[PDB]
């Protein structure tokens, strides 16, 4: 484990902050489950509860931001930097085709509110190069 990078430092904060639904500075299972999808992590139901069980030394099933920060931190660095990539690919692929087309890209471009061939050599392989 390294000193965690600033760029990722914010992402953690943003995750926690952006997805505290009821806005009580804690996350509970439901919030925690969505909070981690923002950092790419998608863990088994069992697993998630497991975590809340571990760091809720507070009693009554919640997670302080500090604990949260500590955790996702190790997860981000200790993560296969290619699994990071793998999920990203899995997410553009709505139709589960195997190759990203524009109906799965403008799909994103639009869902946030030129250079078509830019990084095209014709898949997961061309991906990592970016």
Give every CB contact of residue 95 below 8 A, 6+ residues apart in sequence: 103, 104
The reply on whether position 26 binds Ca ion by CB under 5 A is: yes
Residue 49 interacts with, from Ca ion, a second copy, other proteins, none (CB under 5-8 Å by kind): a second copy
Cβ-based neighbours of 48, under 8 Å, separated by 6 or more: 29, 32, 33, 36
Residues that bind a second copy (CB under 8 A): 21-22, 29-30, 45-46, 49, 118, 121
39 and 76 in contact (C-beta within 8 Å)? Answer: yes
**Which two structure tokens, joined as six digits, stand for 22?**
């009821």
- Tokens 């078509």 — which residue? 116
Q: Which is nearer to a second copy, 53 or 83 (CB)?
A: 53
Structural contact between residues 82 and 128, judged by C-beta atoms closer than 8 angstroms: yes
**Is 3 part of any known ligand binding site?**
no
**Residue 45: which of Ca ion, other proteins, a second copy, none does it interact with, CB under 5 to 8 A by kind?**
a second copy
- 123 binds, options a second copy, other proteins, Ca ion, none, Cβ within 5 to 8 A by partner type: Ca ion
Ligand-binding annotation for 126, yes or no, is yes
Contact positions vs Ca ion (CB under 5 A): 20, 22, 24, 26, 93, 95, 97, 101, 104, 120, 122-123
């Amino acid at each position: 484990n390294s000193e965690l990078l600033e760029e990722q430092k914010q992402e953690i904060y943003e995750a926690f902050s952006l997805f505290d639904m009821n806005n009580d500075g804690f996350l509970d299972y439901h919030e925690l489950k969505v909070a981690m999808k923002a950092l790419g992590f998608e863990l088994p139901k069992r697993e998630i509860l497991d975590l809340i069980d571990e760091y809720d030394s507070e009693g009554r099933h919640l997670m302080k931001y500090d604990d949260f920060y500590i955790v996702m931190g190790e997860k981000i660095l200790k993560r296969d930097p290619l699994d990071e990539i793998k999920r990203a690919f899995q997410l553009f692929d709505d139709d589960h085709t195997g190759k990203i087309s524009i109906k799965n890209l403008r799909r994103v471009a639009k869902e946030l509110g030129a250079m078509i061939e830019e990084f095209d050599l014709d898949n997961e392989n061309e991906f990592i190069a970016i």
